[PDB]
Write a protein that binds this ligand. Structure first.
Ligand code: CMP
Ligand code: CMP
Length: 275
């Protein structure tokens, strides 16, 4: 076991930084404690290359604070495929598939990261993903909207999703809120409402259906709220995973978007500007 001593201020900041990391959701309190003890802090300077495309993987990072740009060099040209804003994680691909870094991550401000060495990672996270794969691989392959992906790409979706459970009445997401997750209902029922004024029910999602994609596609705040009816289980994915893996089905989703407009105009007379 690898262990790094941390001040009290570090443990509080570390625990708060890890609370929403999807790759840690399917871990028991004991595996999680080992991960926490293995975490070490790392300061980064603005302009610093935390990760360079092509290198061997070494650590997995959870963001404590700071901004970062994501670059993928495609044919001598560097594209900015996204960014991180004071929250999130990265560097898990090289450690899961033993491949070279697939992108360059640069800090665009001073910041801090929580690192986790590859050994502790593969020993716990990777071991845990195998378990996750046995529970959901079948379910994910069967989703109609994911048929657009190559079969190998679909299997990779399982590696980065995390399970989230909600009790009856819990708010899953709120209208007007910023968005960082894409959801897939695993079990239970999710009620979608929108405020004209009072809240109006506009849709319900059952096993196999998704929601929370509109904000990620149009880059806007959540257009509606979502609450759980009874006990709900959702498979969540962060926006970076969404953009890396679901590009192939940005059509089927774009096609479902148009429907959102018609429905709202029909119910309210205005499209509420969701596009
Ligand atoms: N579109 C993307 N392609 C590849 N890596 C990405 C992308 N968006 C974010 N990343 C992250 O950037 C990291 C770069 O190193 P890794 O390949 O280990 O893991 C990668 C992911 O965690
Ligand atoms: N008519 C609709 N307009 C907007 N969002 C809708 C509608 N029907 C269902 N939704 C879903 O509710 C989600 C609310 O958050 P998002 O905007 O991220 O994504 C939205 C869609 O997935």
């Amino acid at each position: 076991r690898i262990i790094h001593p941390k001040t009290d201020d570090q443990r509080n900041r570390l625990q708060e930084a890890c609370k929403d990391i999807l790759l840690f959701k399917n871990l028991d309190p004991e595996q999680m404690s080992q991960v926490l003890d293995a975490m070490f802090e790392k300061l980064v300077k603005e302009g610093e290359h935390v990760i360079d495309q092509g290198d061997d993987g070494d650590n997995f990072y959870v963001i404590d604070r700071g901004t970062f740009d994501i670059y993928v060099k495609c044919d001598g040209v560097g594209r900015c495929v996204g960014n991180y804003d004071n929250r999130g994680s990265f560097g898990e691909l090289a450690l899961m598939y033993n491949t070279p870094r697939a992108a360059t991550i640069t800090a665009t401000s001073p910041g801090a990261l929580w690192g986790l060495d590859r050994v502790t990672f593969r020993r716990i996270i990777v071991k845990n993903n195998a378990k996750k794969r046995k529970m959901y691989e079948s379910f994910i392959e069967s989703l109609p909207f994911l048929k657009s992906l190559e079969v190998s790409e679909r299997l990779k979706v399982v590696d980065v999703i995390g399970t989230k459970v909600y009790n009856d009445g819990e708010q899953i997401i709120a209208q007007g809120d910023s968005a960082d997750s894409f959801f897939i209902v695993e079990s239970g029922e999710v009620r979608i409402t929108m405020k004209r004024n009072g809240a109006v029910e506009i849709a319900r999602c059952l096993r196999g259906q998704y929601f929370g994609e509109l904000a990620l596609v149009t880059n806007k705040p959540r257009a509606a709220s979502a609450h759980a009816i009874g006990t709900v289980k959702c498979l969540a994915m962060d926006v970076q995973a969404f953009e890396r893996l679901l590009g192939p089905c940005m059509e089927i989703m774009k096609r479902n978007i148009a429907t959102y407009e018609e429905q709202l105009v029909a119910l309210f007379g205005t499209n509420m500007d969701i596009v």
